[PDB]
Design a protein around this ligand. Structure first.
Ligand SMILES: [Cl-]
Ligand SMILES: [Cl-]
Lengths: 181, 182
């Protein structure tokens, strides 16, 4: 990306000081979604990064993930595979648990959606702890998918997510870096 | 408009699951269309072609399956995408509308700043069933001064009365794949 493209994307994102709490600056991708140029540019740069990488499927987690994975799948000309909250997918699934503050949640994937020989790109809005992406990489590999790549609009470089994913053999590509926890 | 062959390709791309989510029902599963790059691209390209001269200034999609169809149509039209979300997910000032579900009610929210007077909105969703969520979405759009006359769907469950419900709001529905049942 050019410095002009990267600053336009940074400037398209609203930061809500002390949302959802004091000291937390929420990075709001909805202002990017509503801007024709910023949204298109975010998708075009991700497609350009992966066009030669032999990607055969794009995975996006529910729900903001869908907004960036699905357009990147269409731009690469490959299928889109949703990873969802429990009880929403209708065919055979597998499930992975990830930790939150005061408990856990689960993500599910269709078992038939990823096959051995598939090379998968994960795409999400924002890299924070990386917990959800770590669980998504576990789902993909349980299905025999190869995954080495995760792409983000925003990376919160203070929260350790990139290094967490590197422990799984994931290289992260992020358009907009922001500080804050 | 869409060719008969294109419509048959889209209809054949959608899996039907016997006795899900309850016995005697045939669940129309759009995830098989998402997985097929030809069917997914064809669906998006057709919806963009249908509305390319309609003066659309914004596309609205409801969480979550709606995002998979409305956001690519927004990019094809080269207009902004505005999500309508389940409560407590949008971080800035919202308004809310209540709608009916099988076992009660729930709300959808929109950012108050996302639609303005002069906006002409296309609503895009995966599937037209009762139409309750789209009815609520149309109310949100019009509360903000947006015009909305058009909703587009991948699937229309024509037995469930959705299209006629949306006609009572002045909405014309366009759907790619009709199915009987629920
Ligand atoms: Cl949001
Ligand atoms: Cl509906």
């Amino acid at each position: 990306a050019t410095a002009q493209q990267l600053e336009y994307l940074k400037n398209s994102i609203k930061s809500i000081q002390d949302y959802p709490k004091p000291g937390i600056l929420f990075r709001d991708v909805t202002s990017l979604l509503e801007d024709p140029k910023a949204y298109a540019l975010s998708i075009d740069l991700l497609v350009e990064r992966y066009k030669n990488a032999g990607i055969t499927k794009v995975v996006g987690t529910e729900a903001r993930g869908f907004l960036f994975g699905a357009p990147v799948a269409l731009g690469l000309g490959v299928g889109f595979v949703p990873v969802r909250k429990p009880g929403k997918l209708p065919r055979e699934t597998i499930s992975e648990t990830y930790d939150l503050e005061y408990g856990t949640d689960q993500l599910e994937i269709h078992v038939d959606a990823i096959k051995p020989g598939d090379k998968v790109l994960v795409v999400d809005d924002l890299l924070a702890t990386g917990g959800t992406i770590e669980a998504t990489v576990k789902l993909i590999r349980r299905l025999g998918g190869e995954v080495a790549d995760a792409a983000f609009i925003i990376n919160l470089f203070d929260l350790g997510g990139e290094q967490r994913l590197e422990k799984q053999g994931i290289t992260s590509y992020s358009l907009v870096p922001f500080p804050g926890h």
